[PDB]
Design a protein around this ligand. Sequence first.
Ligand SMILES: O=P(O)(O)OC[C@H]1O[C@H](O)[C@H](O)[C@@H](O)[C@@H]1O
Ligand SMILES: [Ca+2]
Length: 448
Amino acid sequence: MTLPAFKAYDIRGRVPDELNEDLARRIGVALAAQLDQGPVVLGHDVRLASPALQEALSAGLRASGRDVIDIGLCGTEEVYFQTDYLKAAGGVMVTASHNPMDYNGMKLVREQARPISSDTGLFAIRDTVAADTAAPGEPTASEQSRTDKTAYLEHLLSYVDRSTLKPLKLVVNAGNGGAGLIVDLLAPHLPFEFVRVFHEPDGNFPNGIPNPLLPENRDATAKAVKDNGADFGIAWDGDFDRCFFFDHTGRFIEGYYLVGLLAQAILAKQPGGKVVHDPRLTWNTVEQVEEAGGIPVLCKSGHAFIKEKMRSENAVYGGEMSAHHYFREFAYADSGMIPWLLIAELVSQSGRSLADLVEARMQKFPCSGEINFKVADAKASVARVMEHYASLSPELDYTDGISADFGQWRFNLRSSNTEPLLRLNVETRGDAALLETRTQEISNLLRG
Ligand SMILES: O=P(O)(O)OC[C@H]1O[C@H](O)[C@H](O)[C@@H](O)[C@@H]1O
Ligand SMILES: [Ca+2]
């Protein structure tokens, strides 16, 4: 067989049978052979076992003659940022995301924080690690601790005109992940009043593994917003590359609508720019991008495809409905910090609430939200859906699974690249009834 921890986009598995210090050291050795010249940036999340896995990576990298830049406890975007900013050969973030307590993982990048994925180095690393029975060498290169976040913080603040910001009251919910550290470093430079929920980093996760999409976790932010009269709330996943927004009513804003909102915010600063979006939900983004004078660029989902499309297009911004937002100036990488700074600036400058910034868009392009299906036979299930709708002659697009545009409604149906699931998204042209009947119709076909 093959090592199960090696997935399409990253390394993820149970400790210690799928991932451990020995495997981590071998990954460091193997990564050294895959990179162009330079040092390697290493960072880690709040999970209890993450430092030891990072130390093992460092030992393997240094035995292979790579200098290591240890940026310490951080978010995933800090590994991206420092890898690019320091002109390093690559970087590794040790992060378990929202996998169980006995799980960990790694996200690996090369120069300019370009992703290393299954077909771009990750399976090559896997195959080297799998066959590597050599005795561990000793270090022939040094590790330096670089915990200065000044350049990173300055970069984040560069996205907004601080003199235009108003003293909004913002709920922030790190979920006991790492986001609060950055919020607190930014706060002296911002006028906002922060209401801090689940703020302290704690890899024991007394309030649940960080996952703002789970209703119990969602409700903690919503309650804080409502009880404190906050202008809006922001929650993050544990490594804070995903951000989640709650309006002043406590309502969670579906991530689809943040793509168009952020695109308009960015296009104000960079007129005429291209914006990359995924094929899951599209109509609102295309319209908002065009209305703001930008050019929308359809791309397959998944951060590696998005980033390379952005690079080839000089796109200023890209966004997925799955709470991933990519910024050209940020090494084409995703940040969970840039988006809420931009939204806070937009609320400050416009005088409009976050709710009102999205309300009409949500009415105009209502969507199902992503609905996941584990079925016995995904291919047969997709075929049943397509056969059922064939007589309507939808416009079909195969950029990522199947997108079918029927005129007043459309859907995207695709296999996930991170879980063995089918993912469905439906949207309509201002028609909530059609959305529900078509969503239920497709759901019945998929489960048939
Ligand atoms: O919908 P999936 O194929 O499961 O991918 C869902 C998400 O997985 C990871 O988080 C990637 O970084 C994202 O770019 C991707 O959108
Ligand atoms: Ca994350």
